[PDB]
Write a protein that binds this ligand. Structure first.
Ligand SMILES: C=CCO[C@]1(C(=O)O)C[C@@H](O)[C@@H](O)[C@@H]([C@H](O)CO[C@]2(C(=O)O)C=CC[C@@H]([C@H](O)CO)O2)O1
Ligand SMILES: [Mg+2]
Ligand SMILES: [Mg+2]
Ligand SMILES: [Mg+2]
Ligand SMILES: [Zn+2]
Ligand SMILES: [Zn+2]
Lengths: 219, 216
């Protein structure tokens, strides 16, 4: 199984630097070129650069958008890809993906990581408040939720019953309002199952290392 | 430089119908050494990473459904999806690798389906928020189509709001929306009736969900 996993994303100030990593397994790393690609929220993919394979001397190339400011390197002992980013600006705010690239034979990016989110801002890290959404006084089905309010930067992750409830879940994209994000998540279950069984939302905000379980208790 | 351009920006197709989308390059991508076009298509579903579908213009990657076909040559390329499925909702990108690499701007494919009314739920502020001095009231409008919907908040009968829509659902092709009204505790405690009213083209009657503070 091929695995690519980016790490190192988070909040940084304008003018600052950041280094991202991309750990790989499940293929002969040195055989492959590796690329970095970014995507600002709601916008198109942008190719940033690659580093070539052993056959081509591990040389690098960059889009003119980032040449001179970003550097790509690789650890061939450990199968890890790196992106050094300097003089960061608002426009660098994006999800960064590593992608397995050329092997000398195929023209394709066969595999991509899950991506790591970089936020370039002067704003402070603020952990979320997490509030249960339980029905008032108010059926075959019941809808519950969690409100994840007033955090910065993105992202947060929300699961229900540690991921065992996945069907009938909707997580509403975060909205920024006076410098903080708020998001919500709904889960719908048969009413014969709640509150008789426990329903809990699990919320993580990596920038503040926040981990929350909030059980949804009937009022 | 090599400029990649895609068309349309977006479109919506009903399940079972054919989808056609285009990708143009400013220079021919036909490599003279191998006589292949260095043009690949990627599918990016909502909240997921891009996934390889097609490369060398027409080679379908293993594990990719038969319904996806890449075609074209030189400067102009096409991705065709036959018998489109609900799960095909995604942004589709083309990418040249003739000279370094460059992605097109993408085409957003949405799924058209029958009109569906929302299921509306209202939630009072939690005690753990009220203790803090704030009061957020939340309304979920779930599983509706089409996307356009109106939400009005009424407090003691008369009309600080965050609205958010989900991406389209990959299984049933509906949208959902959350509307959050935030007040101070001092203001919340002045009034009794809290109401969110959803108006959608599926009914001339708004769907009204309400609670009263005295009944909490
Ligand atoms: C291994 C050499 C080149 O491959 C790349 C590169 O710049 O590293 C990456 C490939 O994905 C592709 O863009 C090729 C490009 O097609 C040039 O490759 C050829 C060619 O197709 O004509 C292939 C072999 C030799 C090479 C140069 O003549 C000498 O390296 O050209 O570039
Ligand atoms: Mg140089
Ligand atoms: Mg739904
Ligand atoms: Mg008033
Ligand atoms: Zn070079
Ligand atoms: Zn009043």
């Amino acid at each position: 199984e091929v695995k690519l996993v980016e790490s190192g994303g988070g909040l940084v100030q304008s003018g600052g630097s950041l280094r991202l990593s991309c750990a790989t397994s499940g293929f002969t790393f040195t055989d492959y070129y590796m690329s970095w690609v970014r995507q600002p929220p709601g916008k198109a993919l942008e190719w940033l650069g690659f580093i070539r394979n052993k056959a081509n001397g591990y040389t690098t190339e960059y889009s003119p958008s980032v040449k001179g400011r970003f550097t790509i390197s690789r650890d061939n002992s450990q199968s890890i890809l790196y992106l050094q980013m300097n003089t960061l600006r608002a426009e660098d705010s994006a999800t960064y993906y590593c992608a397995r690239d050329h092997d000398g034979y195929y023209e394709r990016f066969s595999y991509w990581g899950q991506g790591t989110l970089v936020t370039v801002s002067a704003a402070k890290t603020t952990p979320p408040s997490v509030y249960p959404l339980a029905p008032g006084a108010a059926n075959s089905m019941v809808t519950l939720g969690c409100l994840v309010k007033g955090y910065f930067p993105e992202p947060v992750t929300v699961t229900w019953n540690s991921g065992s409830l996945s069907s009938g879940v909707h997580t509403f994209p975060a909205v920024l309002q006076s410098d903080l994000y708020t998001l919500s998540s709904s889960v719908t279950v048969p009413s014969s199952t709640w509150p008789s069984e426990t329903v809990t939302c699990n919320v993580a905000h990596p920038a503040s290392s926040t981990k929350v379980d909030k059980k949804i208790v009937p009022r | 430089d090599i400029v990649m351009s895609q068309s349309p920006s977006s479109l919506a197709v009903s399940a079972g119908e054919k989808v056609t989308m285009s990708c143009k390059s400013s220079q021919s991508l036909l490599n003279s050494r191998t006589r292949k076009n260095y043009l690949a298509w990627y599918q990016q579903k909502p909240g997921q990473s891009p996934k390889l579908l097609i490369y060398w213009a027409s080679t379908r990657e293993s594990g990719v459904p038969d319904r996806f076909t890449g075609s074209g040559s030189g400067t102009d390329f096409t991705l065709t999806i036959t018998s489109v499925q609900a799960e095909d909702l995604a942004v589709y990108y083309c990418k040249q690798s003739y000279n370094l690499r460059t992605f097109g701007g993408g085409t957003k494919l949405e799924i058209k389906r029958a009109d569906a009314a929302p299921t509306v739920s209202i939630f009072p502020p939690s005690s753990e928020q009220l203790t803090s001095g704030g009061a957020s009231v939340v309304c979920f409008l779930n599983n509706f189509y089409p996307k356009d919907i109106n939400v009005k908040w009424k407090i003691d009968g008369s009309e600080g709001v965050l609205n958010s829509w989900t991406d389209q659902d990959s299984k049933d092709s509906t949208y959902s929306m959350s509307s959050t009204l935030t007040l101070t505790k001092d203001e919340y405690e002045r009034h009794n009736s809290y109401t969110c009213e959803a108006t959608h083209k599926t009914s001339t009657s708004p769907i009204v969900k309400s609670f009263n503070r005295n009944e909490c």
